[PDB]
Amino acid sequence: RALPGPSQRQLEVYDQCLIGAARWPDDSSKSNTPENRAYCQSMYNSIRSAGDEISRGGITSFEELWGRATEWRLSKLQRGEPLYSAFASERTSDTDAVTPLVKPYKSVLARVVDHEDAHDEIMQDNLFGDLNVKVYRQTAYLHGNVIPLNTFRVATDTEYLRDRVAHLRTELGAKALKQHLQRYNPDRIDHTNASYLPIIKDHLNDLYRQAISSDLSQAELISLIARTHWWAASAMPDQRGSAAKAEFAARAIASAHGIELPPFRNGNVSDIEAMLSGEEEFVEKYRSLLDSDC
């Protein structure tokens, strides 16, 4: 059964231009820019246009939807073919993905360390040696099976590091020390093993198929949107741009039912909030990562 489709009651522009922003709690300067408002409004507009087609039966599978997200995102790249390739390619199971917790991701270090669910662990390094890391281990549950996801790690004997890093540099070379920190920074996110992504992807068509019901209440819809957001963002299916695509898709399904979600709150980067939480936590906290204030 067909669906309403995007609303005609649109968010005020000031809010369009914040759809898919990355409103870092430590630099919402980039949220305010002319280009980033331009980027966001475009995402706003292409979400609804995907919105239009979910309503009509056009987009049959979450993978098709994710394509639309990817097509959109690529047309915003003014970068070139190494970078184009990345935003357009799924992560393959023969690689790992890693985000070092340098700028602009510094706000995250604190989020891991004061996180109730964090462990204290020992991380054994070939260059620095042994390290105390606060470790958050995101895990989903699916069919009743446990799927590790992203693993945050923050190194905590900081003094020893700055000393040891400076030490290590001059021998191997920054060249050879950079090498190491691109992949093995004491502070880093290690993302979902690309191997889990087939079953996650199957799971997402399942959710997608469910959420393009007609019979669902407002509550159970938003739940299913938060989830789809939650899984897609946390799987990080692509080499780059996953956060942008997750939000786009989560929103396109909303608009297909005639919902108009607002921007996310400031300091609430959607894919990080998702990554740093479990599923039901995020589903319930969802409506308030959103700027729902008149």
Partner: peptide, 25 residues
């Protein structure tokens, strides 16, 4: 002791802050 992470000050070898992909070992 330094802020978390701030042991990585002015290091020319500071990683870049975006997702990198590597071959599995």
């Amino acid at each position: 002791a330094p802020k978390f992470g701030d042991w990585d000050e002015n290091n020319p070898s500071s990683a870049d802050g975006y997702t990198h992909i590597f071959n599995k070992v």
